[PDB]
């Protein structure tokens, strides 16, 4: 639902992430896979080791979708609707796993931007990550 404040905050934090969003995504995936091993089952084909090239590759793609969402935050359903069919319709992704990854994304962002990860901004980023997740599982619901 996101207030005018949360939008500003998400754009603020995003801009700051900058040309490092690719790397951030790879790292947030790596955190997930290590912290929540159950998520691994969905990636039987990847090599999930640390410097995996498929993890870097996939981290950029995750990052590119989140950037589309941000740039289109007032029309996320349209922006992301294709990816909802992918996730909620073909790969059948257990919705719990959207929580785990949003969590790891926040940890990654807190690890990288100690100046901009304030409470109000952590709140906005949570909300924005909950938003994206509601759209990616909407075929379910």
């Amino acid at each position: 639902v996101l207030s005018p404040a949360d939008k500003t905050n998400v754009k603020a934090a995003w801009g700051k992430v900058g040309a490092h969003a690719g790397e951030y995504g790879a790292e947030a995936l790596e955190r997930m896979f290590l912290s929540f091993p159950t998520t691994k089952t969905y990636f039987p084909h990847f090599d999930l080791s640390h410097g995996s090239a498929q993890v870097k590759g996939h981290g950029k793609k995750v990052a590119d979708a989140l950037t589309n969402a941000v740039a289109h935050v007032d029309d996320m359903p349209n922006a992301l609707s294709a990816l909802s069919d992918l996730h909620a319709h073909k790969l059948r992704v257990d919705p719990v796993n959207f929580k785990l990854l949003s969590h790891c994304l926040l940890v990654t962002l807190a690890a990288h931007l100690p100046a901009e990860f304030t409470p109000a901004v952590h709140a906005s980023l949570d909300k924005f990550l909950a938003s994206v997740s509601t759209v990616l599982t909407s075929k379910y619901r």
Binding site: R31, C104, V107, T108, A110, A111, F117, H122, A123, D126
Partner: protein, 146 residues
């Protein structure tokens, strides 16, 4: 909660560094800011209406410090998280009736707070170890519901 020598190495090395003066009030404040239905449990405490109010509340930074205690406690007794948390579980379950899910959420904001504070040192392997612990504690607190 089993933990390997290396996980344990990763958890205790880190935790020694931890500013037990502040982090406990960071976690609690952020919990009340990010997940506002939890303020329902601290309406006393006081000015909780804006993020700034919450983070400057003497009573938030004082209690959060109590809470980190229980956490350094569990680090001690990982082999026995339930006995350790049994009177607190009674408290949060039977007296307060806190939904166990919020035990998870606190665990996770505490991990954000350790990420914020330690930056690059809070590597993925060190986060993995802390999530095990965090899940251990939440599970312990919840027991009196089981």
């Amino acid at each position: 909660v089993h933990l390997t020598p290396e996980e344990k190495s990763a958890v205790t090395a880190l935790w020694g560094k931890v500013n037990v003066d502040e982090v406990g009030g960071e976690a609690l404040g952020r919990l009340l800011v990010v997940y506002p239905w939890t303020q329902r449990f601290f309406e006393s405490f006081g000015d909780l209406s804006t993020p700034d109010a919450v983070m400057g509340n003497p009573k938030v930074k004082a209690h959060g410090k109590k809470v980190l205690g229980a956490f350094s406690d569990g680090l001690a007794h990982l082999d026995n998280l339930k006995g350790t948390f049994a009177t607190l579980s009674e408290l949060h379950c039977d007296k307060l009736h806190v939904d166990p899910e919020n035990f998870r959420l606190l665990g996770n904001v505490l991990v954000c707070v350790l990420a914020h504070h330690f930056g690059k040192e809070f590597t993925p392997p060190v986060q993995a170890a802390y999530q095990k612990v965090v899940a251990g504690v939440a599970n312990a607190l919840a027991h009196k519901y089981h």
